[PDB]
Amino acid sequence: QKIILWYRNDLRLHDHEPLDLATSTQGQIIPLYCFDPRQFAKTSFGFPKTGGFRGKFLLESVADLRHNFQKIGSNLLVRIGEPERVIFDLVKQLNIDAVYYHKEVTAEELAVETALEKALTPLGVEVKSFWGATLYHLKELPFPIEKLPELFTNFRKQVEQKSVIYPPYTPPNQLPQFPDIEPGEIPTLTELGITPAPFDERSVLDFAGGETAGLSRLNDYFWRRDCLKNYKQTRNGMLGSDYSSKFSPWLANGCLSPRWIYQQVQDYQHQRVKNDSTYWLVFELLWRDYFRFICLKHGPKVFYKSGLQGVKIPWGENWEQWQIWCQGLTGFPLVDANMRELAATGFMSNRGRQNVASFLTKNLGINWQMGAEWFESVLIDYDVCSNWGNWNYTAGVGNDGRGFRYFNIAKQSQDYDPMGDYVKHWLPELASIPDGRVHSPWRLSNQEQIRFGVRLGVDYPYPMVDLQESVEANRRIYEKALRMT
Ligand SMILES: Cc1cc2nc3c(=O)[nH]c(=O)nc-3n(C[C@H](O)[C@H](O)[C@H](O)COP(=O)(O)OP(=O)(O)OC[C@H]3O[C@@H](n4cnc5c(N)ncnc54)[C@H](O)[C@@H]3O)c2cc1C
Ligand SMILES: Nc1nc(=O)c2c([nH]1)NC[C@@H]1CN(c3ccc(C(=O)N[C@@H](CCC(=O)O)C(=O)O)cc3)CN21
């Protein structure tokens, strides 16, 4: 009769089975979001657990969720504290009969679920969890999770052949009255202890948190601007808002459901064009599904330094070299521009993420966990499974069927930034080097350095490694570690 709808990374009213089931019972529904202080502490290497870019986006997303509940006659209860304690107190305060929530798959989130169930079972309060973050739901997979294929291509073949994607649930348009209790202040970044990040106008979007803004972004990218038809051709871009969907920060905290996006793709294919690009956006959502299922199957191994594959590697952890990567002072413009874009905006293109993660692990040989945690801190779109899964894959410990692979920074620079437009946008100190030559500033003569206004070792660093020598050294280490496994 009285149900708390506990929200975490599912900040929406569309495609929300817990909300759908609760509204069908006609009991009193009490939506709740808890700001969990453990989310605003530190990662193991000491970075803010939630940096300022994602913090601002989260606060905007929680405010929008509250507003959207208010529009249909309810509200969102907001509290600060550990949910296993906050919900226990609220259950006693309001004589709650049931708590509904969405299932997570990684250790920290599972510990909260376990502690909550332990706290509530003495009270006889029903706890009901729902699977809701993926395109294909766990129950539609053609295999148990223990038999999830260890290669993505095999996962994709089997689900596309044998499984069905279902339409999103439609949100309710009316809810019972909110209880006569203090609604709760949504805290500021200051109150959470998070440093606010000034806006950099070069941000690919002025990202705004919330289901409302995420739905509008899809409306812009699919319908108003008709970009989806070109997605496969543009998705390796690094400048501009519309080289890709930019749906990721809304998918990561659940402002958008992948099943809602998929329904819109089906509509676009029916109404405009069906081609390799409309499929490829779904293809990338499938990668998102796969990393989440991989984390479900393998549990905490995705966080172990030896990774999903269990390969013990003598990774380096030199702080000075790591800091140079973090600050984009490596001397390689493609890497440096991407790291500085991340530090200024909280976002990095997929093409950039592949390159900087390869540089850290294949050129510097530095522990991939240090990169994964930096991404966790700074990314506006941090998704634990996609981030930690992708870092395992990049580092060669993901069972990806490829062995030692690496990104040739020189070739990637020519292929994806041939005129230097991207690196000059983020590295103004290099912007007067003639196009293309900008990717190898170490080749400039003393006279050219003066003419183009940039002196190596002063205005822009010399390369911190030789690309070829460093990859060869780390390849040998990887090969030996693989042999010893
Ligand atoms: C080292 C590394 C770390 C990453 N960390 C994250 C992370 O924390 N969160 C995150 O959502 N993605 C992460 N990615 C995946 C990918 O780079 C981002 O999803 C993408 O850059 C977001 O831009 P978009 O929304 O415009 O993507 P698009 O190309 O428009 O759209 C694809 C959508 O599908 C998903 N997606 C696309 N590519 C991938 C991929 N390779 N792996 C998983 N999901 C994908 C995202 O939800 C994305 O919004 C990481 C990739 C690498 C190599
Ligand atoms: N949103 C989110 N959820 C998480 O669960 C999560 C993150 N983010 N970011 C990184 C941390 C780190 N995570 C970890 C890290 C270690 C173990 C673990 O069990 N470690 C082994 C040691 C393994 C080894 O040393 O090789 C242990 O027994 O402590 C579990 C989860 C969980 N992580």
mmCIF file of N, CA and C and ligand atoms in Angstrom, residues 231 235 244-248 251 281 284-285 287-288 291 347-350 353-354 357 375 379 381-383 386-387 390-391 394, ligand 1:
data_model
loop_
_atom_site.group_PDB
_atom_site.id
_atom_site.type_symbol
_atom_site.label_atom_id
_atom_site.label_comp_id
_atom_site.label_asym_id
_atom_site.label_seq_id
_atom_site.Cartn_x
_atom_site.Cartn_y
_atom_site.Cartn_z
ATOM 1 N N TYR A 231 25.757 8.626 -38.937
ATOM 2 C CA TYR A 231 26.485 8.356 -37.697
ATOM 3 C C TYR A 231 27.737 7.515 -37.938
ATOM 4 N N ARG A 235 31.344 9.209 -36.599
ATOM 5 C CA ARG A 235 31.505 8.880 -35.180
ATOM 6 C C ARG A 235 32.953 8.854 -34.703
ATOM 7 N N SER A 244 28.613 12.599 -33.118
ATOM 8 C CA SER A 244 28.049 11.417 -32.481
ATOM 9 C C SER A 244 26.861 11.869 -31.647
ATOM 10 N N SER A 245 26.179 10.908 -31.016
ATOM 11 C CA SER A 245 24.925 11.237 -30.350
ATOM 12 C C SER A 245 25.133 12.114 -29.124
ATOM 13 N N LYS A 246 26.253 11.935 -28.424
ATOM 14 C CA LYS A 246 26.488 12.531 -27.107
ATOM 15 C C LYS A 246 25.428 12.107 -26.097
ATOM 16 N N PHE A 247 24.801 10.941 -26.310
ATOM 17 C CA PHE A 247 23.818 10.452 -25.348
ATOM 18 C C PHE A 247 24.460 9.934 -24.069
ATOM 19 N N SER A 248 25.779 9.731 -24.054
ATOM 20 C CA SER A 248 26.382 8.943 -22.983
ATOM 21 C C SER A 248 26.131 9.459 -21.562
ATOM 22 N N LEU A 251 22.664 8.311 -20.656
ATOM 23 C CA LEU A 251 22.541 6.869 -20.483
ATOM 24 C C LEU A 251 23.196 6.410 -19.188
ATOM 25 N N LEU A 281 24.627 2.762 -34.500
ATOM 26 C CA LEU A 281 24.326 3.323 -33.183
ATOM 27 C C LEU A 281 23.820 2.236 -32.244
ATOM 28 N N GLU A 284 26.693 0.112 -31.085
ATOM 29 C CA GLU A 284 27.428 0.636 -29.941
ATOM 30 C C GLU A 284 26.644 0.497 -28.643
ATOM 31 N N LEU A 285 25.313 0.621 -28.688
ATOM 32 C CA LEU A 285 24.526 0.284 -27.506
ATOM 33 C C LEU A 285 24.707 -1.181 -27.122
ATOM 34 N N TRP A 287 27.528 -2.875 -27.416
ATOM 35 C CA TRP A 287 28.766 -2.902 -26.648
ATOM 36 C C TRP A 287 28.516 -2.489 -25.206
ATOM 37 N N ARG A 288 27.675 -1.470 -25.009
ATOM 38 C CA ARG A 288 27.298 -1.057 -23.665
ATOM 39 C C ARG A 288 26.614 -2.194 -22.903
ATOM 40 N N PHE A 291 29.391 -4.942 -21.945
ATOM 41 C CA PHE A 291 30.258 -4.681 -20.806
ATOM 42 C C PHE A 291 29.499 -4.834 -19.497
ATOM 43 N N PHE A 347 34.415 15.575 -20.980
ATOM 44 C CA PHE A 347 34.088 14.700 -22.099
ATOM 45 C C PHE A 347 35.316 14.486 -22.973
ATOM 46 N N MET A 348 35.355 13.326 -23.621
ATOM 47 C CA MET A 348 36.360 12.988 -24.620
ATOM 48 C C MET A 348 35.677 12.107 -25.652
ATOM 49 N N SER A 349 35.984 12.323 -26.929
ATOM 50 C CA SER A 349 35.450 11.445 -27.969
ATOM 51 C C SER A 349 35.897 10.003 -27.755
ATOM 52 N N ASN A 350 35.115 9.077 -28.313
ATOM 53 C CA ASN A 350 35.501 7.669 -28.287
ATOM 54 C C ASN A 350 36.866 7.450 -28.935
ATOM 55 N N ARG A 353 39.435 8.564 -26.431
ATOM 56 C CA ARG A 353 39.571 7.650 -25.300
ATOM 57 C C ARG A 353 40.410 6.426 -25.670
ATOM 58 N N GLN A 354 40.166 5.847 -26.849
ATOM 59 C CA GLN A 354 40.972 4.718 -27.286
ATOM 60 C C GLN A 354 42.446 5.090 -27.357
ATOM 61 N N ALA A 357 44.087 5.965 -23.768
ATOM 62 C CA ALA A 357 44.204 4.786 -22.917
ATOM 63 C C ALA A 357 45.288 3.863 -23.443
ATOM 64 N N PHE A 375 39.532 8.581 -15.247
ATOM 65 C CA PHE A 375 38.293 8.655 -16.012
ATOM 66 C C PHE A 375 37.078 8.610 -15.085
ATOM 67 N N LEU A 379 35.057 11.974 -15.894
ATOM 68 C CA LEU A 379 34.097 11.838 -16.998
ATOM 69 C C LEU A 379 32.680 12.245 -16.604
ATOM 70 N N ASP A 381 30.228 11.285 -18.146
ATOM 71 C CA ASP A 381 29.420 10.127 -18.514
ATOM 72 C C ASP A 381 29.934 8.834 -17.899
ATOM 73 N N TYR A 382 30.651 8.907 -16.778
ATOM 74 C CA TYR A 382 31.158 7.700 -16.139
ATOM 75 C C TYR A 382 30.071 6.650 -15.976
ATOM 76 N N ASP A 383 30.337 5.480 -16.543
ATOM 77 C CA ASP A 383 29.523 4.288 -16.364
ATOM 78 C C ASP A 383 30.497 3.221 -15.902
ATOM 79 N N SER A 386 31.054 0.302 -18.468
ATOM 80 C CA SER A 386 31.667 0.692 -19.732
ATOM 81 C C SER A 386 33.084 1.200 -19.524
ATOM 82 N N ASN A 387 33.313 1.949 -18.453
ATOM 83 C CA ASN A 387 34.653 2.471 -18.220
ATOM 84 C C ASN A 387 35.616 1.359 -17.843
ATOM 85 N N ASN A 390 36.064 -1.180 -20.705
ATOM 86 C CA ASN A 390 36.898 -0.690 -21.801
ATOM 87 C C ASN A 390 38.367 -0.611 -21.397
ATOM 88 N N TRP A 391 38.653 -0.227 -20.149
ATOM 89 C CA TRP A 391 40.049 -0.160 -19.724
ATOM 90 C C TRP A 391 40.681 -1.549 -19.665
ATOM 91 N N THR A 394 41.409 -2.339 -23.364
ATOM 92 C CA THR A 394 42.556 -1.575 -23.841
ATOM 93 C C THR A 394 43.866 -2.143 -23.314
HETATM 94 C C1 LIG B 1 39.099 3.949 -22.066
HETATM 95 C C2 LIG B 1 37.626 4.120 -22.338
HETATM 96 C C3 LIG B 1 36.772 4.502 -21.305
HETATM 97 C C4 LIG B 1 35.403 4.671 -21.531
HETATM 98 N N1 LIG B 1 34.591 5.085 -20.473
HETATM 99 C C5 LIG B 1 33.285 5.192 -20.710
HETATM 100 C C6 LIG B 1 32.412 5.582 -19.616
HETATM 101 O O1 LIG B 1 32.758 5.806 -18.460
HETATM 102 N N2 LIG B 1 31.077 5.704 -19.983
HETATM 103 C C7 LIG B 1 30.554 5.471 -21.237
HETATM 104 O O2 LIG B 1 29.329 5.574 -21.429
HETATM 105 N N3 LIG B 1 31.387 5.075 -22.241
HETATM 106 C C8 LIG B 1 32.673 4.974 -21.992
HETATM 107 N N4 LIG B 1 33.502 4.652 -23.032
HETATM 108 C C9 LIG B 1 32.866 4.322 -24.338
HETATM 109 C C10 LIG B 1 32.766 5.468 -25.354
HETATM 110 O O3 LIG B 1 34.021 6.101 -25.602
HETATM 111 C C11 LIG B 1 31.687 6.478 -24.948
HETATM 112 O O4 LIG B 1 30.446 5.812 -24.734
HETATM 113 C C12 LIG B 1 31.440 7.544 -26.016
HETATM 114 O O5 LIG B 1 32.634 8.305 -26.211
HETATM 115 C C13 LIG B 1 30.307 8.467 -25.624
HETATM 116 O O6 LIG B 1 30.000 9.349 -26.726
HETATM 117 P P1 LIG B 1 28.600 9.312 -27.443
HETATM 118 O O7 LIG B 1 27.448 9.288 -26.518
HETATM 119 O O8 LIG B 1 28.633 10.483 -28.430
HETATM 120 O O9 LIG B 1 28.679 7.907 -28.227
HETATM 121 P P2 LIG B 1 27.997 7.394 -29.568
HETATM 122 O O10 LIG B 1 29.052 6.953 -30.514
HETATM 123 O O11 LIG B 1 26.981 8.394 -30.048
HETATM 124 O O12 LIG B 1 26.829 6.594 -29.158
HETATM 125 C C14 LIG B 1 26.978 5.276 -28.638
HETATM 126 C C15 LIG B 1 26.356 5.133 -27.279
HETATM 127 O O13 LIG B 1 26.572 3.753 -26.962
HETATM 128 C C16 LIG B 1 27.457 3.633 -25.876
HETATM 129 N N5 LIG B 1 28.802 3.360 -26.380
HETATM 130 C C17 LIG B 1 29.398 3.815 -27.530
HETATM 131 N N6 LIG B 1 30.617 3.370 -27.715
HETATM 132 C C18 LIG B 1 30.825 2.536 -26.629
HETATM 133 C C19 LIG B 1 31.917 1.737 -26.241
HETATM 134 N N7 LIG B 1 33.062 1.657 -26.928
HETATM 135 N N8 LIG B 1 31.808 1.047 -25.084
HETATM 136 C C20 LIG B 1 30.676 1.135 -24.383
HETATM 137 N N9 LIG B 1 29.578 1.842 -24.655
HETATM 138 C C21 LIG B 1 29.718 2.526 -25.795
HETATM 139 C C22 LIG B 1 27.301 4.906 -25.061
HETATM 140 O O14 LIG B 1 26.211 4.699 -24.163
HETATM 141 C C23 LIG B 1 27.019 5.945 -26.156
HETATM 142 O O15 LIG B 1 26.253 7.027 -25.614
HETATM 143 C C24 LIG B 1 34.888 4.443 -22.817
HETATM 144 C C25 LIG B 1 35.741 4.061 -23.847
HETATM 145 C C26 LIG B 1 37.105 3.902 -23.619
HETATM 146 C C27 LIG B 1 38.003 3.475 -24.757
#
